[PDB]
Amino acid sequence: SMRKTIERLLNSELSSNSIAVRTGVSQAVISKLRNGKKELGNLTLNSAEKLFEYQKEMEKVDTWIVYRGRTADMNKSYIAEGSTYE
Amino acid sequence: SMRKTIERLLNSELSSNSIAVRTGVSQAVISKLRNGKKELGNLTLNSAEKLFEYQKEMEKVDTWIVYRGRTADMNKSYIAEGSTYEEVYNNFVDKYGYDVLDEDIYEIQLLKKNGENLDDYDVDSDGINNYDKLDEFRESDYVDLEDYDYRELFENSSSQVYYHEFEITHE
Amino acid sequence: MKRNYILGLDIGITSVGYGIIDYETRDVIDAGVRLFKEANVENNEGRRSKRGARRLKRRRRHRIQRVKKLLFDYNLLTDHSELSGINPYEARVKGLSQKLSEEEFSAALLHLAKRRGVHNVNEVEEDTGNELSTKEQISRNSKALEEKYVAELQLERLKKDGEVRGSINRFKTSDYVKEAKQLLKVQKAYHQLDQSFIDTYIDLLETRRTYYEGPGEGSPFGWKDIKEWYEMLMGHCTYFPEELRSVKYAYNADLYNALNDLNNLVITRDENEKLEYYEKFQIIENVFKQKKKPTLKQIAKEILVNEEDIKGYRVTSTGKPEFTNLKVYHDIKDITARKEIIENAELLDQIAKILTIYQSSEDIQEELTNLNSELTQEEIEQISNLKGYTGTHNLSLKAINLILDELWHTNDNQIAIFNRLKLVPKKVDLSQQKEIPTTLVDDFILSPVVKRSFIQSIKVINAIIKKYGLPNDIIIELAREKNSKDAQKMINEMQKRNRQTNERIEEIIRTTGKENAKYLIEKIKLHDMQEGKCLYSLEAIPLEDLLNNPFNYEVDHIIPRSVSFDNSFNNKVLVKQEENSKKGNRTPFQYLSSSDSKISYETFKKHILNLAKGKGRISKTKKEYLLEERDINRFSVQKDFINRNLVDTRYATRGLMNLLRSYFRVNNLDVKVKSINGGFTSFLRRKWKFKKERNKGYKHHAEDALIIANADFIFKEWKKLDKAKKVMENEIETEQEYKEIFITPHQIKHIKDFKDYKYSHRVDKKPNRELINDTLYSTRKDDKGNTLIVNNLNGLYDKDNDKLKKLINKSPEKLLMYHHDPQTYQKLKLIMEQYGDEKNPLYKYYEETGNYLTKYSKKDNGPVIKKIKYYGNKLNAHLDITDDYPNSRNKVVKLSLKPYRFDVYLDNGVYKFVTVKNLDVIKKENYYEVNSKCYEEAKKLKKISNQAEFIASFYNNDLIKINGELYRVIGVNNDLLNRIEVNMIDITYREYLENMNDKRPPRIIKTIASKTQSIKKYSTDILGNLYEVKSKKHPQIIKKG
RNA sequence: UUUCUAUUUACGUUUUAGUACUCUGGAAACAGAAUCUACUAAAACAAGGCAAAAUGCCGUGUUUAUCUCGUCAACGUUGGCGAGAU
DNA sequence: ATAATTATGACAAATGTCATAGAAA
DNA sequence: TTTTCTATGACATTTGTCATAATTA
């Protein structure tokens, strides 16, 4: 539960309720953290891990994907590549 | 504060009180986590970051290898220590000098590892005696020693350091 | 001539750099560095352990000789008699009964004598590498020797185990004496013996020199009797010459150390912060006489105040508070608690001295018995078994009483007591001496590295005084590292810390997604230490906000730098710009007391104390700086800060400072000498931006020294710190004023541009330095007529030693076994092939069969094989000692003749040299003289004519000039091939290779045999001037030594 | 701040000698051979230098530019002293 | 309308930071 | 002796969970 990454989620433009739904942590706790009524240090490791895991997914940018497709006989091969699966 | 690393410190042989003094956390909590009366998840990030920072240093274990070498009579003792065996050789040739180990041992091992025949270079008690040829071999890109053979460099010298005993500490 | 100048010293562990600065113009008259090979305790442990051996060998030989002479007297042993075939063990057992023939008897007596065994069981001084301690071994042997004498046990071991020698044959002298007298009582009934002979033989068998008798007559390391023994072991006290130094664990000196700690303690109370005579007596009595190990909590309870108010005490490495305890007094109370013993200072002192000097308990009990005290006989036996009293040289008792009296009455500390009393060393009269005397450095107890550095530094001072006149000011820095083993440990630890911080920084850069962390390392280090909490307002601080808006937070100093003189991260914090602006050049105490802060002082203290304990993020000094309630305006408090941060306090620097100050005061020379802390020069290096690199060679030890001298000039151009100078030699400003005072890089570019950095090295003419590496390798003769050294493979059965394997597969013909005994090679090979996978096939064989590799036998009764000998290499240089070993079929040689010096000759236009080896310098009394015959033989071996002109003679580190490139000789590599070894004068070659990233081998080796146009000799004085040396026309034969 | 000394034990590297080992001649007594591997005694264990039946004694550490003047000492060269120079 | 989001609680059950207890060596 | 070892708990405070009441486009 890196303090810096959890800090990025709390300072993100993502909604407190929206973060809460995905994290599973209460919107109340998220709001009181942004309010400062609560401190990140006093947070249970379980809750801290959930916030850290949720923030990790957003750092999936810069991906490059290649498609190798073989015809049923494994003989003729079709290959294409691009930034997003689209 | 990765749960796995804290789980590793809890599973360590270090005394609950020993970790507490170093981390600043209470022996009570560490002992209760180990007993299982307390869940690592329920711990605060503040206290867990402390236990995590402790493990970090232990996780990256740094081996310290201390060379104790006694002269044949067991009377005069030579001792050097360093991080990788290569460091042990480099300290022993600085503090106590090269002429303590057998003459020209570093060169002889390098030539042997590359695969050259030692006899051609006239290996002697003084060691490489055909300096002219050694210089040519050095010119060729030699294959360097692998930090597991500096031990061999120390244990193939009996001129003065007859009894050699290496102690390796991991922490 | 006469030029006012400031002198600066950088006294390292392997160098002493000196620098000269103009008093007026910040100029640089001369810089340099004296060098010397690192002193090591080991070498002296070498000479001493060996001396200790030669002596054991000499005493054994002398006892054998005396017994042989005695047996000639009674006609039992005669020159004609042959003692060759008699077996010692079988004869001792027979003679314990029956009769012994004249030979067998002689063999047995000579035999016991060769080996008497230990006397004081614990007297032994050795490591437990044998896995069986000496005391436990004697205990087991005695438990086995209840009804059997020594000979019986040894013979039984030889017949059953097959061995006698080893670590199992360590006995006690009493059993040997019993066996000797038992056999003699029987054998005297058949041969002509008298009780005088019996007593003489028993005496010779058990005689031994006690530790307080020393060597015999005529020894330089001896003493006439026991009073002289006290004098030698204790030594005359430097402070009062006629009085001898006392022991350290003695009660009075314990009281002195404890009172030092008690005086140092500061307690925040309505009374004075320093404790006064009456409550000091109360605390010392109660705490240090009722509890074995005093703690801070006990002090707080007895004075009934808060432990939170106690500051200024020594702390252990683990953070536990440390208080020196009256160990001897509690040890007394443990056994006996009567009043008559514990309140007698002289009795307790004498008890301590006896326990410390007399190692043997039997001597201790006797010495207390001779002391007419109130001790009872039963109590003396128990007190005699006390241990851990092992300090010999400590301040004299007469001076200890004087210091204790002043300590009791006043709240002062030792340093200022010494200044007030003006105690001056009196071992050597400073008035008569023309130059600072290097003798005084011997007395202070300093490690040999520091002693050598001090002697070299004093010689540098003498040379500079003789050359450029009297120095107006001297600044002395002793470097932090105690010895090299610490320089590496520290460098390794620092590297590890740097790596962990780099790991934090790189992870932060990725998580933030910004590169701001690259210049934000100082703040980000502070953030987690404060846990993102403004220490002045308690408000939580986001790490991301610090990267996004670095200007919203600033690195403020807890204490103003005009007094704190501390610029470490301990004195730095991350605070709100408004908090720093409101705080000013003041202390956090009065500011949190003031209404400007948005938090109360008590809550601040509570948060600081809990934070300090948690996560070890607040250092010990950090909370003291934060909670410094005492006003900085007080002169004593500013002085305390200067001493803790700017003035060195280690014993070594002080002793050198006191010696120099006493010398300058006695001669009435207006010379101010001052010291600088190790971190201050690092800070002043950092802020003047001189730290480009640390591998430019030795010129680093010079440059730092220059900066040191510059410090003096910046402590007199500004009156704001001028008073502080008067404090160091013996108002309050903001931090930007501090930057204005110290950062200013004007006339400091001179250190950057100066290039004439003279260097010098210490020539080592000492003769008898060492002769031949000791390992008496045997030799054999091969088919081709050469001679091969026979190295022996050892520890074959050990798990990690794979030598046998590698040799077997690569070259079997090298094991002597291959030809002299073939069958056994077949057994070894079959074993190596089957279990070849393991690193050590022999260990795996032992792990499955449980048998060592026995020699091949038809009956399978062969002995074990633990050493296999193998031909190794050919023989080139050797000190042939074969003459000592009689009738040797094969030669016996030693290797690596250590060269003493080499003399260069110019014959027929070509330069050759003859190596005067150390073996050719024979010693007659005081003088050391070069063996003429061996020198002539070596000269003729080099094909040198008798009219060859003599050029020079080079010892170690004498400067040589070959073909125009200067070098320093380390010693000749191979004489036959005419190769000498030189390392460059400025930077050690190993470093010269790294600054070019070259991979050439590390030792420059140059050849003088041919194509050598010039071989001149240059020499350099302790300062470092380079003067070409014109030597004498005959090589030196007699060195006074 | 922890150096400088002090006494002692067992080992240990080596040679010789002996007993086992290996081998050949050979029925072998033994004769040898080989000197390899284990024990066992004795001897040497920095080159050596004193000393003279002594609980004997020194030899791997500290201190070190070189040349010179004179002074003094050991003994001519080294000292040591001083005073210079390079 | 309406839904997602934003602020405060209540409460059972923990936690950090201090002890002590008894043991163990 | 005595001095750290685990274990257990006290207490003031804070959690996590599970609510509301409001809010705005």
Residue numbers in the entry:
A (entry chain F): 0 to 85
B (entry chain C): 0 to 170
C (entry chain A): 1 to 730, 743 to 1053
Question: What does the report in the manuscript say about this coordinate set?
Answer:
AcrIIA15 is an anti-CRISPR (Acr) protein that inhibits Staphylococcus aureus Cas9 (SaCas9). The AcrIIA15 protein, consisting of 170 amino acids, is comprised of two domains: an N-terminal domain (NTD) from residues 1 to 56, which contains a HTH motif resembling a transcriptional repressor, and a C-terminal domain (CTD) from residues 57 to 170. AcrIIA15, by combining the HTH domain and Cas9 inhibitory domain within a single protein, exhibits dual functionality as a bi-functional anti-CRISPR protein capable of both transcriptional repression and CRISPR-based cleavage inhibition. Our structural and biochemical studies demonstrate that AcrIIA15 functions as a dimer to simultaneously inhibit both anti-CRISPR operon transcription and SaCas9-sgRNA DNA recognition.
To address this, we reconstituted the SaCas9-sgRNA-AcrIIA15-IR quaternary complex by incubating these four components together, followed by SEC. We then determined its cryo-EM structure at a resolution of 3.82 Å. Although the resolution of this structure is not high, it is sufficient to reveal the relative locations of all subunits. The interactions between IR1 and AcrIIA15NTD, and between SaCas9-sgRNA and AcrIIA15CTD in this complex are the same as the ones that we observed in their individual structures. However, a structural comparison of this quaternary complex with the AcrIIA15-DNA complex revealed that the position of the AcrIIA15 CTD relative to its NTD is shifted from its location in the dimer:IR1 structure. Although the DNA and HTH domains were well-aligned, both CTD domains are rotated away to accommodate SaCas9 in the quaternary complex. This indicates that the AcrIIA15 dimer undergoes a significant conformational change upon binding to Cas9. Additionally, the short loop connecting the NTD and CTD of AcrIIA15 is flexible, enabling the structural rearrangement of AcrIIA15 in distinct states. Due to the presence of two inverted repeats located upstream of the promoter region, we posit that two AcrIIA15 dimers together with four SaCas9-sgRNA effectors could simultaneously bind to the AcrIIA15 promoter region.
